[PDB]
Amino acid sequence: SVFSERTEESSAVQYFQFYGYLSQQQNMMQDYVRTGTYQRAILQNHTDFKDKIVLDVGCGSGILSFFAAQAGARKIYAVEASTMAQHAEVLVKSNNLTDRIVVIPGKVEEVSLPEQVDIIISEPMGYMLFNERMLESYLHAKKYLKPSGNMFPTIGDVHLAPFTDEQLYMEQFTKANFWYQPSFHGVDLSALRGAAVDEYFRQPVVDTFDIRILMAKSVKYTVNFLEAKEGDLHRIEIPFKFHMLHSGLVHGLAFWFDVAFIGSIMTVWLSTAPTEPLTHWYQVRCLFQSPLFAKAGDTLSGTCLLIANKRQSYDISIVAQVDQTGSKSSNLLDLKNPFFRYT
Amino acid sequence: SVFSERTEESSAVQYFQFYGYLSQQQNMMQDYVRTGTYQRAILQNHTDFKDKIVLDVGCGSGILSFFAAQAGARKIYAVEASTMAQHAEVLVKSNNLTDRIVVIPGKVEEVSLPEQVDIIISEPMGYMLFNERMLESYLHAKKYLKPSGNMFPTIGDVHLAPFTDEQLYMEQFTKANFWYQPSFHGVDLSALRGAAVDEYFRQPVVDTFDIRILMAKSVKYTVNFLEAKEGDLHRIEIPFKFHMLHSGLVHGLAFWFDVAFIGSIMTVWLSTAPTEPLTHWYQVRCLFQSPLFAKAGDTLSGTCLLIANKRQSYDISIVAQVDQTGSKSSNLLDLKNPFFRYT
Amino acid sequence: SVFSERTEESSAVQYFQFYGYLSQQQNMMQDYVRTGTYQRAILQNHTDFKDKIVLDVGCGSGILSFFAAQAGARKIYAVEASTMAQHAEVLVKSNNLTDRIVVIPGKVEEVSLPEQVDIIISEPMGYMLFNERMLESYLHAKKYLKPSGNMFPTIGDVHLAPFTDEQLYMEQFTKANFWYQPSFHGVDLSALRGAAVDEYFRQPVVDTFDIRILMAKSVKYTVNFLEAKEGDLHRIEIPFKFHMLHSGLVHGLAFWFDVAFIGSIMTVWLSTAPTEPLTHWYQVRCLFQSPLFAKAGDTLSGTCLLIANKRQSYDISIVAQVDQTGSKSSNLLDLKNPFFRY
Amino acid sequence: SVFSERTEESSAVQYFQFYGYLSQQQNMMQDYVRTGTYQRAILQNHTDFKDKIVLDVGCGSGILSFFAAQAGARKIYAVEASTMAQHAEVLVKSNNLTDRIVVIPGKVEEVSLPEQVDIIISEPMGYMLFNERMLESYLHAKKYLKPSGNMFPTIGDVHLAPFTDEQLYMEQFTKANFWYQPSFHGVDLSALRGAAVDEYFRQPVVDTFDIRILMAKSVKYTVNFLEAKEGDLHRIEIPFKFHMLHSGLVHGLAFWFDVAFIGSIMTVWLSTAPTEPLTHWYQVRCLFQSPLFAKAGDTLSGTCLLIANKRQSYDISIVAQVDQTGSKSSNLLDLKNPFFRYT
Numbered sequence A, B, D: 001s002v003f004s005e006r007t008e009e010s011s012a013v014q015y016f017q018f019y020g021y022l023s024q025q026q027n028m029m030q031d032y033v034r035t036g037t038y039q040r041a042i043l044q045n046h047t048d049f050k051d052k053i054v055l056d057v058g059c060g061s062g063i064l065s066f067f068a069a070q071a072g073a074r075k076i077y078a079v080e081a082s083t084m085a086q087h088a089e090v091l092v093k094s095n096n097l098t099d100r101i102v103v104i105p106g107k108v109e110e111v112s113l114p115e116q117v118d119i120i121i122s123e124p125m126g127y128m129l130f131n132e133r134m135l136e137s138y139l140h141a142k143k144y145l146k147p148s149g150n151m152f153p154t155i156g157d158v159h160l161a162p163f164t165d166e167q168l169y170m171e172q173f174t175k176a177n178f179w180y181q182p183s184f185h186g187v188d189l190s191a192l193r194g195a196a197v198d199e200y201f202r203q204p205v206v207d208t209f210d211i212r213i214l215m216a217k218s219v220k221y222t223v224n225f226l227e228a229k230e231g232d233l234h235r236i237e238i239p240f241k242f243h244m245l246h247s248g249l250v251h252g253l254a255f256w257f258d259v260a261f262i263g264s265i266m267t268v269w270l271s272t273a274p275t276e277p278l279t280h281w282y283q284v285r286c287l288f289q290s291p292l293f294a295k296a297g298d299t300l301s302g303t304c305l306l307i308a309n310k311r312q313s314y315d316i317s318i319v320a321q322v323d324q325t326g327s328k329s330s331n332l333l334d335l336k337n338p339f340f341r342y343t
Numbered sequence C: 001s002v003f004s005e006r007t008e009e010s011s012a013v014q015y016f017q018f019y020g021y022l023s024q025q026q027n028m029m030q031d032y033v034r035t036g037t038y039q040r041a042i043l044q045n046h047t048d049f050k051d052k053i054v055l056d057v058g059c060g061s062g063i064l065s066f067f068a069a070q071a072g073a074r075k076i077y078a079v080e081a082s083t084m085a086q087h088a089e090v091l092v093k094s095n096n097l098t099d100r101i102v103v104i105p106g107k108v109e110e111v112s113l114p115e116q117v118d119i120i121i122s123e124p125m126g127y128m129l130f131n132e133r134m135l136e137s138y139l140h141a142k143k144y145l146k147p148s149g150n151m152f153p154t155i156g157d158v159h160l161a162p163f164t165d166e167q168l169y170m171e172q173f174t175k176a177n178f179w180y181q182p183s184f185h186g187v188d189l190s191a192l193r194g195a196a197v198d199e200y201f202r203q204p205v206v207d208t209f210d211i212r213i214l215m216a217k218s219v220k221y222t223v224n225f226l227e228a229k230e231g232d233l234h235r236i237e238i239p240f241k242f243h244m245l246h247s248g249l250v251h252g253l254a255f256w257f258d259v260a261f262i263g264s265i266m267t268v269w270l271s272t273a274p275t276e277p278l279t280h281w282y283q284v285r286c287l288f289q290s291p292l293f294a295k296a297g298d299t300l301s302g303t304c305l306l307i308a309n310k311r312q313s314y315d316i317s318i319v320a321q322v323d324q325t326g327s328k329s330s331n332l333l334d335l336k337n338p339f340f341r342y
Ligand SMILES: Nc1ncnc2c1ncn2[C@@H]1O[C@H](CN(CC[C@H](N)C(=O)O)Cc2c[nH]cn2)[C@@H](O)[C@H]1O
Pocket: A003, A015, A016, A019, A028, A029, A057, A058, A059, A060, A061, A062, A063, A064, A079, A080, A081, A082, A084, A106, A107, A108, A109, A122, A123, A124, A125, A126, A132, A134, A137
């Protein structure tokens, strides 16, 4: 299948094991911004669901499929690869919806659906939008979408902005400085100093922050889920040019994302921006090993390149330079090893 | 190999990826009780090392092998299956010890050593001693131990004791009762409440506690690493009879462990008991789904059965009864999904 | 002379020029702990001065010689190598003390005095007690001291103690990390990071601190100015063994000093300890390039080696180890390039 | 040499020791106005560098030679007298520029260079432009300049303007009056008060200030580095006539400087004026011994005579008079002993 060809079996097993726990579905369900906004998108666009055929990609507990059923969907195929599929089946029965929600266990890349659908619904967003590579499954599922069918969410916007945060920088450098020791219990560790700095600075920082740390207006990169192909997400190139609003040290780039549900009645937005109420996605920051100095009015330009790997994640390179001075930073990000800093 | 035959590939890949991070090695190295006690055990028993041949099973950074070299070992074979082997090799060279420490990349079940050794050293302990199943690799390695050779650690003592903790117990229902609502965004979740209760109670609780919650003197189960065979750890039956020192409700069993380094000069102990300073192992509690009343002077008897699984962990079965009343509790736990509660 | 042979001409010139400024003499005079304690030492031991012959080594403005005169000295030779000597003479005349204070311009190693003295007074202390090497001039001056004469100050105690201060450490590490940049205006500086770390960590830090940063009781090293020879200060070896009172990272050693005026009536102490009011000497901290972890109850052992150099300062060597773990640190510092942090 | 004959050895030793510190090179490098403007001057005038032969007088870290290299210079001779030369060599090697930058340790007055150059670059400016007397080394280096050559910077403008600052003036007496007491610990200090006043007034004050203290447009004295001889800087007679824009007491003269890089493409200015962001040069103020009253519309005329001395600095002689009233004042100041007042 397309999934197994792009996914290490080792990664896939642990991945779907993780989502088979009720505690994990609960954590997601209790993100009220997430769950409430999905419900609003669907119910406020009920005419996009009434008497329609729906596919829920990765249904989990089934919660989005219940929302499609509240909106009057005639038939909802709820596909789920983890053992959570069996818990969804239980809720479909106890909610008396056996004639409308059909749970189909397995990967959306591998199952058979009896018919084409009017609309696909999913929550495939990970950290920094792309983590976990579930958007590829979402796009793959379009083989079941009628021409002129819709996608909920319809588009995804990644936002990037430079930040200054000396304390965060020093926190990570302090941990790395362990490997500078020339006599840890009599052992010289210092030859690994470089490897340790590299490793810690490869960790995306997952937490929230005050918007006053942002040094320029964000740049937006848009993915249109109606148009994009699965293969497009194997290589994601995000160019940026920031007009610096403040002078200082740029310690890295901050990332967040919005998705829009573009329905017939209205467009509903789900935002994970630092200006919005907190979600379980928080925000994500890359750090530079060496911060870049820039003054207000300078431009900071470069690219964030995401190259998909077999662990349902990405090898990320961020290159940024202050155009006026040629001060450049090249960085790697290991999205598989995030630092969850939030308390 | 013996390792690949007892381990699901998916579990093995994530396991060794975890130990390939310098930050994870650092976390273990920075446990001063752990690292300092190993150094003391080895240095204070220098005649067990001076001019000896040593095997370090799972050398990680190489730290124990360096301690062996400090104690005067002639040759140390330092085996490591993660990519951390490459970093250990860098430290061996940078510490000018290439003539005495040989880093061998690979699983100790799969590599070849060029000769037999006098002593095996390792830090293979997990939560409640046995988690991760690395003790089997440690025992497996005795195929390379000379007759009358030694093992450091030499023995491992698992301790179990009944505890009372009403707040920890009640916490499981607080969490599970998320599912006991008839209209979560219009969805009746209540049919999954039982499954959620079961899932939470199947999680051993990793954290520390006040020793005043303990209701009887612990029972000790000893594994002698000199005598034990790898297969001995596939099924571990721990009978217990507690003589209750306090009256109250017993909510479960608390677990901790000690290891002893039985050298020619002295025996050194490493303890993770709740009466000792905290280590990265904390302590582990397994709840009974139904608590038992016992009075001081009553006896609480039963068995803890640990059955190894191919996810490098154990299925735990605990059955307990208050002999004087016949009140009984039976519980099943999954050590691969611990709940990390410590704050 | 003994002074010129141990001293680089470049250093001596700038050194005595510095002390030729009235603004600099004023700054020292305005250290009330210093000036007030010297006056108490001398006046409360007035019998060590009454009708005595006194030598003031490096008299500056003359202030200590005036204290000696207040205490009843018969004749005070006030030796001063900088042009401040001429200002001291102006004050001796305007204070009508020409019959008692004789200003002698020049280095104490080179001038001639008409007679031997009963007691020598001086303020020769620098940062970390020994900086500027003026204690050698003070000891040299004992060639003019009658047998059994006294010295004010009489003894000097150097104190050393381990400290923890993560922010200071990272402050210095931060400055050095400038030289880690692979693209400073397009230029790769990183090959100099090592050299930069070495340079910054060679700077003793001059400022004060909270006493709660100290991780063990101080070790004391005593110089008895009555017994010591000038040559004793060329290489000063201070062994130490600290009994750690707290667990944590040791970022370096803190230094301060006391001097005692052991007079016939009473002993008066001038202390620059962090438990005492601040003086112009502050305290001094020598950072380790990498902190040492230790637990309460551990012992931190080693040696502090102070080697006098030809720029009137010291090359500092600190080697320390946590005995229980073998964790060892070696450091070299240049007291001629301090970081004034206060 | 020309350097040793104009410089006291004690001064030269301390001077080059000072610049052998990386911390001192860093301080200059981190002056963004300074470093960024040199870079801009050089890169935006790239036709003045491409395939050219360049001499960097007093190269320090080598930073300006790397800018010359960024602009396409074919060969750069980088002369440095302090031990910083050895660090510049390291950077040249590590930046793979050994074929284009040659580091020549020593004084530009004393070393041998093999060929004539198209352009000399340097940063030889001190406080009040002339302090440290490095501009003479810069001009001396024109013995290596082709007749059709250029100098970067090309011209230097010293600016002088009258100021009113009652608090600065009074401060000298507040400090000197320490000595005006009859019983400082029993000692009459009063006889030294005049000497103390004299000493404070001989020190130029290095700090910045609000431009509103300035009472007239500055008078500009220009040194054209392309045309000037090093001997032109041994005695610098700066006449001035200020047209007073404000009425009040004139307490002295404020000094700052600009330099211009007059290239083929454009002229780039580096300014240390109090109307511009602060640099590590700040500004300099020389007090009059007695303030002068002047009305808006009056003319304040006189001369500032800078007499080079062998301590790599200048004796500053200022005579000033209000023409309409004949009120006159002077001062004699020692630029080698400035008072750093800035907080
Ligand atoms: N190829 C695949 N075929 C089938 N199923 C898949 C596939 N890939 C992933 N999954 C499943 O999607 C689920 C995603 N998570 C729950 C979504 C649910 N609709 C809700 O809103 O609560 C959200 C989520 C988590 N991280 C990102 N989104 C999770 O149960 C996975 O096992």
